[PDB]
Paper text:
This converts the status of RNA from Cap-0 (me7GpppA) to Cap-1 (me7GpppAm). The 2′-O methylation of the first nucleotide converts the status of [name] cap from Cap-0 to Cap-1, and thus, helps the virus evade immune surveillance in host cells.
The enzyme appears to go into a “breathing motion” during catalysis, wherein the substrate-, product-, and byproduct-bound states represent fully closed, open, and partially open (product released/enzyme reset) states, respectively. The position of SAH in the product and byproduct structures remains essentially the same, except for the carboxy tail, which rotates back in the byproduct structure to assume the original orientation as in the substrate structure. The byproduct SAH in both structures binds similarly in a cavity at the C-terminal side of the parallel β-strands, except for different orientations of their carboxy tails.
Numbering used by the authors:
A (entry chain A): 1 to 298
B (entry chain B): 18 to 131
């Protein structure tokens, strides 16, 4: 009813609890479009509605944060999503970005190549990704789980994310993976979110809140993608740009959260309760250093 | 003793009637801000628009050296304000005007000292 005055729509809890089989996707809209304000690009409006929904959850925010961003270049030679992320975060925060082809940018430091040649020495408080390949969509053969750049992402999280941190990662009907749905059961809460300015497509963002380092429930990833296609096929959504006109409350609030270092045998039920409500981070606090690998035969 | 001078090949290309540079990046904001020229967050008023800094610099966009014993860019990593009746060529506006070192406004379009 009043859905057209929000920034978007999230998946309800009773659809997550069923046992369905997989089918083809077919939407009632498709070839409709929204009306944008004078002179504004489509990817500036999409990143503004995602940051307005994250302001309603329980994230941790310390003195001297650290953030990293994959898939950030474009076919024009510049970077629009990196300029919206630096307007939202507090002054003093450090930020790094990357892609497979060359481009120009506003971040503190930048690297060029395939994602499997990248290495770092320290740990991070938040991670964002928009990578995609268009040769995946074909309606003439069967629809199976995919590998490629999804195999690198599952390993980076288990080795270099701090206890207490968060993530957000993009998918579609034919671009998806079954162990990534199984790792959402190692956080305290999870969902899937759709923006009101691109609602005639099958795109969404997969989100995890406050990390614990071991399993809390068990999930089968082939059955949970088929429950997500059933929801979209029986509930249609109306297109809108109302929320881009009121910006008086946009910036993220400074909480001052505390930081400690601890060894694997000191974690008791008092500690585990503090991580679940957004009030503690665990890692070391030294300097930051990075690099990239090069092959010689020329 | 030879070196190239590209600030003046653009000025002569426009005077014969060429098309200005495109795809500079514009932002959403309240339009009740301060009015000054270069800042750490957006500050436009009722007569202005605001843009991201790297996409409006001539040396960054052509892939060449910055004119300074120690290459230093004045714009990368910040935000810049432009008057609404000149917003079809933002690269040309910044190459021609100068800032006041006392109040922070553009000379000709805001400063009221002398
Ligand atoms: N293996 C890989 N390594 C790195 N980048 C990759 C990749 N596979 C795909 N990509 C990149 O994923 C990107 C998808 S389009 C990105 C649009 C951009 N975020 C904007 O703000 O407008 C492309 O630029 C593509 O080069
Ligand atoms: Zn420059
Ligand atoms: Zn003055």
């Amino acid at each position: 009813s009043s859905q057209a005055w929000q920034p978007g729509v999230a998946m309800p809890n009773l659809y997550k609890m069923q046992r369905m089989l997989l089918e083809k996707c077919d939407l009632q809209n498709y070839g409709d479009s929204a009306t944008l304000p004078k002179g504004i690009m489509m990817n500036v409006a999409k990143y503004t509605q995602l940051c307005q929904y994250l302001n309603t959850l329980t994230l941790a925010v310390p003195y001297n944060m650290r953030v990293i961003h994959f898939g950030a270049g474009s076919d024009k030679g510049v970077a629009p999503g990196t300029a919206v992320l630096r307007q939202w975060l507090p002054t003093g925060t450090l930020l790094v970005d990357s892609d497979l082809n060359d481009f120009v940018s506003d971040a503190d430091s930048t690297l060029i190549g395939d994602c499997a040649t990248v290495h770092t020495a320290n740990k991070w408080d938040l991670i964002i990704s928009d990578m995609y390949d268009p040769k995946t969509k074909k309606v003439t053969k069967e629809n199976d789980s995919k590998e490629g750049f999804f195999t690198y992402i599952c390993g980076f999280i288990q080795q270099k994310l701090a206890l207490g941190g968060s993530v957000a990662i993009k998918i579609t009907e034919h671009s998806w993976n079954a162990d990534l749905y199984k790792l959402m059961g190692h956080f305290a809460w999870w969902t899937a979110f759709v923006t009101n300015v691109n609602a005639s497509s099958s795109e969404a963002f997969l989100i995890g809140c406050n990390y614990l380092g071991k399993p809390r429930e068990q999930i089968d990833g082939y059955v949970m993608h088929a429950n997500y296609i059933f929801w979209r096929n029986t509930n249609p959504i109306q297109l809108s740009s109302y929320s881009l006109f009121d910006m008086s409350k946009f910036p993220l609030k400074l909480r001052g959260t505390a930081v400690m270092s601890l060894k694997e045998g000191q974690i008791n039920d008092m500690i585990l309760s503090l991580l679940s409500k957004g009030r503690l981070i665990i890692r070391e606090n030294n300097r930051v250093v990075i690099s990239s690998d090069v092959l010689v035969n020329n | 003793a030879f070196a190239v001078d590209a600030a003046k090949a653009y000025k002569d290309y426009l005077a014969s009637g060429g098309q200005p540079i495109t795809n500079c990046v514009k932002m959403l904001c309240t339009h009740t801000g301060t009015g000054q020229a270069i800042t750490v967050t957006p500050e436009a008023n009722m007569d202005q628009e605001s843009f991201g800094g790297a996409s409006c610099c001539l040396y960054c966009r052509c892939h060449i050296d910055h004119p300074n014993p120690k290459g230093f860019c004045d714009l990368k990593g910040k935000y810049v304000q432009i008057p609404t009746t000149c917003a079809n060529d933002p690269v040309g506006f910044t190459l021609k005007n100068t800032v006041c070192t006392v109040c922070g406004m553009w000379k000709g379009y805001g400063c009221s000292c002398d």
